[PDB]
Amino acid sequence: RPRFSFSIAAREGKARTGTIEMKRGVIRTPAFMPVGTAATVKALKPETVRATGADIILGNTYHLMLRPGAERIAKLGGLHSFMGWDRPILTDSGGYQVMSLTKQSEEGVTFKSHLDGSRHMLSPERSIEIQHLLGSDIVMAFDECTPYPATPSRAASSMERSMRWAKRSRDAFDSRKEQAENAALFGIQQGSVFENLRQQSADALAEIGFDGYAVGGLAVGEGQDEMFRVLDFSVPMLPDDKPHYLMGVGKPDDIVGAVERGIDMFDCVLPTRSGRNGQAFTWDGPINIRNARFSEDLKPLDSECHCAVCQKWSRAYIHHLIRAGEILGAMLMTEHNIAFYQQLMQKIRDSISEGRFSQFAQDFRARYF
Amino acid sequence: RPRFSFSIAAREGKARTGTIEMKRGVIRTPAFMPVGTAATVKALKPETVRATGADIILGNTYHLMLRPGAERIAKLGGLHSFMGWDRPILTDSGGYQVMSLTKQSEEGVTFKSHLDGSRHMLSPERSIEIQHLLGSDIVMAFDECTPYPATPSRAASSMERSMRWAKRSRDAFDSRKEQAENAALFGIQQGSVFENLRQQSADALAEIGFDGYAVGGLAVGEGQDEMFRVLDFSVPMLPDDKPHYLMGVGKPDDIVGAVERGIDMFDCVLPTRSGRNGQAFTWDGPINIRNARFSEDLKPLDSECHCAVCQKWSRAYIHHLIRAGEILGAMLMTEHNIAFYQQLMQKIRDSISEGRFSQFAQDFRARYF
Ligand SMILES: CN(C)CCSCc1cc(N)cc2c(=O)[nH]c(N)nc12
Ligand SMILES: CN(C)CCSCc1cc(N)cc2c(=O)[nH]c(N)nc12
Ligand SMILES: [Zn+2]
Numbered sequence: 001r002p003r004f005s006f007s008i009a010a011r012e013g014k015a016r017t018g019t020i021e022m023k024r025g026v027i028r029t030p031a032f033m034p035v036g037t038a039a040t041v042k043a044l045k046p047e048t049v050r051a052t053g054a055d056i057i058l059g060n061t062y063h064l065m066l067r068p069g070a071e072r073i074a075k076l077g078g079l080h081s082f083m084g085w086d087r088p089i090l091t092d093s094g095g096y097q098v099m100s101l102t103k104q105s106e107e108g109v110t111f112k113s114h115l116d117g118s119r120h121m122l123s124p125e126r127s128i129e130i131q132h133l134l135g136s137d138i139v140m141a142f143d144e145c146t147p148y149p150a151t152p153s154r155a156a157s158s159m160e161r162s163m164r165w166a167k168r169s170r171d172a173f174d175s176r177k178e179q180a181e182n183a184a185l186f187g188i189q190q191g192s193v194f195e196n197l198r199q200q201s202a203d204a205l206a207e208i209g210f211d212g213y214a215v216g217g218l219a220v221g222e223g224q225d226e227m228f229r230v231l232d233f234s235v236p237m238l239p240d241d242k243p244h245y246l247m248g249v250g251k252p253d254d255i256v257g258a259v260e261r262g263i264d265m266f267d268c269v270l271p272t273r274s275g276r277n278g279q280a281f282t283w284d285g286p287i288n289i290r291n292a293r294f295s296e297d298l299k300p301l302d303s304e305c306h307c308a309v310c311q312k313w314s315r316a317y318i319h320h321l322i323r324a325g326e327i328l329g330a331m332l333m334t335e336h337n338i339a340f341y342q343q344l345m346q347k348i349r350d351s352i353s354e355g356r357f358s359q360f361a362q363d364f365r366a367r368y369f
Numbered sequence: 370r371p372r373f374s375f376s377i378a379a380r381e382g383k384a385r386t387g388t389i390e391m392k393r394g395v396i397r398t399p400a401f402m403p404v405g406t407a408a409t410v411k412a413l414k415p416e417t418v419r420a421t422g423a424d425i426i427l428g429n430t431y432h433l434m435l436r437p438g439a440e441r442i443a444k445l446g447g448l449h450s451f452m453g454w455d456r457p458i459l460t461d462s463g464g465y466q467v468m469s470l471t472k473q474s475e476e477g478v479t480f481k482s483h484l485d486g487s488r489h490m491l492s493p494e495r496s497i498e499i500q501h502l503l504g505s506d507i508v509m510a511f512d513e514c515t516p517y518p519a520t521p522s523r524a525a526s527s528m529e530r531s532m533r534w535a536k537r538s539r540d541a542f543d544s545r546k547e548q549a550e551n552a553a554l555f556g557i558q559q560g561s562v563f564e565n566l567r568q569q570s571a572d573a574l575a576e577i578g579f580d581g582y583a584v585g586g587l588a589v590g591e592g593q594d595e596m597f598r599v600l601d602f603s604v605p606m607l608p609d610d611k612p613h614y615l616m617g618v619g620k621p622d623d624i625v626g627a628v629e630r631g632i633d634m635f636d637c638v639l640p641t642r643s644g645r646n647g648q649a650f651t652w653d654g655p656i657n658i659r660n661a662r663f664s665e666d667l668k669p670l671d672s673e674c675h676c677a678v679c680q681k682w683s684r685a686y687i688h689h690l691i692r693a694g695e696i697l698g699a700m701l702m703t704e705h706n707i708a709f710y711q712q713l714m715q716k717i718r719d720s721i722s723e724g725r726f727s728q729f730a731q732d733f734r735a736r737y738f
């Protein structure tokens with residue numbers, strides 16, 4: 001296959017469905033990327049992740065540069081070989097999380113490990129290098145976190161810095177032969193909720209040129225209405241012939257709405273994180289399996305779900321497992337949830353290909369809520 | 370198949386290898402039974418347990434009578450259906466653990482739940498009933514725990530009580546039509562380390578008549594030498610044409626030695642428990658994967674092991690996972706360890722069938738240590 005090739009097969013309104021061809025495999029869009037925090041999709045073997053339908057996973061950079069270490073993973077053969085996943089892997093730049101889980105300057109960010117307190121410097125150049133050492137297929141540009149709420153000037157400065165960092169990410173990426181020829185680079189749009197800033201960011205990104213464009217700075221507490229409002233005018237600013245990636249957005253209803261507004265890629269820990277809290281997704285809305293009303297419920301988590309969990313075990317059993325704090329509980333809940341998400345993406349892709357996505361969205365919401 | 374049929378195909382010294390035919394399947398002996406504490410073999414799907422080679426698992430009665438509840442499991446269709454394991458399941462009587470994890474009388478034992486402090490009474494009659502409600506294939510007689518060390522009189526009294534309880538277990542079991550016709554009953558020998566008491570217990574048990582005989586009261590802190598000493602004269606006291614079950618014994622070297630002394634069945638949490646502590650079994654002895662020397666070791670846990678874990682992941686990866694406290698770490702370590710144990714039982718069975726077990730034991734110990 002080629003290094004990177006995105007083609008759109010069908011459209012409906014702002015929605016698109018197509019594929020991204022990469023050396024390690026094909027990615028069907030809109031796509032949902034399970035998240036791999038510590039070089040592992042929480043409680044699942046790679047084969048199980050793949051069995052649910054995932055074509056690509058997100059590698060958690062922040063934790064990996066610390067715990068095992070980028071250099072160590074490279075010595076060991078790279079992330080794909082290390083964890084046993086031979087398909088595409090997208091890695092975030094790490095900077096954002098650092099400014100969450102610090103001394104920030106125009107050159108990067110200095111911080112102390114949340115594990116052993118060690119000091120570390122992370123710059124656009126170092127982020128690209130780390131993602132290269134990890135063997136990432138889709139590399140994210142190193143950007144700066146914009147607090148929410150954010151004033152116009154504060155949002156502008158941070159966005160302007162991110163654009164300067166984007167150019168540096170681009171060059172660092174292109175200066176590394178092996179990486180520029182086998183991996184792809186995604187730029188990240190910033191600008192908070194301000195249209196003029198989003199437009200400036202988009203033009204700067206397009207001027208630099210990337211393989212994909214992400215809408216960053218959202219899902220930071222602005223509520224769905226505001227997020228959708230921002231997506232309405234933000235996504236159209238991005239090049240139409242390249243993938244549109246909404247970072248950190250995963251609630252089913254968020255995904256459906258984001259796709260209606262032109263988003264092609266998603267990632268969220270919610271599926272796996274909710275795979276211990278007791279939250280299981282169903283087409284009739286989410287349920288907390290720990291609730292007493294499920295103690296003797298013999299039905300599967302979801303009446304229609306096709307995943308292996310819904311074929312073999314009952315809510316009553318999973319209920320017991322979660323309340324007993326058993327590992328198998330997390331395993332089954334996580335497999336189901338991730339399978340549910342992939343099934344959601346499949347229905348979205350099919351409905352768009354068949355020109356009935358808008359109706360699907362309406363039917364989905366009516367029942368889900 | 371029949372309700373219960375044990376036949377010996379080969380022998381060598383006191384060692385035997387054969388099969389136990391039961392309605393839900395065949396059990397190859399000597400056999401190792403993975404332990405299922407809360408209606409789940411820790412961190413493994415039933416299919417994975419079976420894939421490692423296990424023909425039967427041990428259902429943890431104590432925890433089940435409390436957490437989900439015997440009556441509830443029966444209402445839900447029984448343990449096999451509940452957890453997704455359709456093969457034989459052996460259940461302990463619960464009494465022993467109660468006197469561990471209390472008011473004791475000739476009628477049974479009164480205790481407070483280690484979960485919510487609730488009060489509960491457990492008698493021979495109630496234990497048999499609970500195992501019936503769980504749908505157990507091999508039911509253990511309700512016996513009394515004999516402290517260690519134990520004086521002759523204290524050991525005699527407790528043993529005499531256990532024998533009275535064994536008769537009651539037998540009758541309660543036979544009075545329940547469905548259970549007596551589809552399940553088997555195992556009596557448990559007691560008597561601490563005293564030969565005369567072990568002989569009395571054995572004669573009483575044989576007088577009552579059971580489908581199998583367990584050597585209880587061992588592995589309570591007496592050390593391997595003493596345990597083996599007790600097994601030397603204890604096992605021969607048991608009927609030769611019925612299975613000999615050593616409860617709570619699982620270290621590889623213990624198993625090999627016990628088989629040389631006539632034991633056909635084993636169970637131990639060590640395999641799974643050591644599947645979080647970082648202990649992985651190898652033919653060169655156990656290793657603690659958390660040790661720094663494994664951080665960049667690309668070799669599998671064991672150079673010869675045939676399990677799926679050793680085919681796909683490295684020590685370095687499992688090392689990272691365990692130190693990061695990831696669930697997958699426990700999953701992989703547990704699958705390997707249980708697979709290692711089943712491989713051990715296979716080698717023992719084959720070596721006996723081929724009349725070279727004694728040599729295998731010698732070769733095993735030389736390398737393992
Ligand atoms: C723990 N995860 C849920 C979050 C990991 S960081 C992923 C992430 C999430 C969100 N909401 C916005 C952004 C953004 O604007 N830039 C970058 N680089 N990453 C982001
Ligand atoms: C937690 N497990 C390791 C132990 C569960 S109790 C199993 C168990 C273990 C041992 N060592 C001896 C005996 C015994 O003499 N009688 C009974 N009924 N059970 C026993
Ligand atoms: Zn499901």
Ligand SMILES: [Zn+2]
Nearest residue numbers: 674676679705
């Ligand atoms: Zn192995």
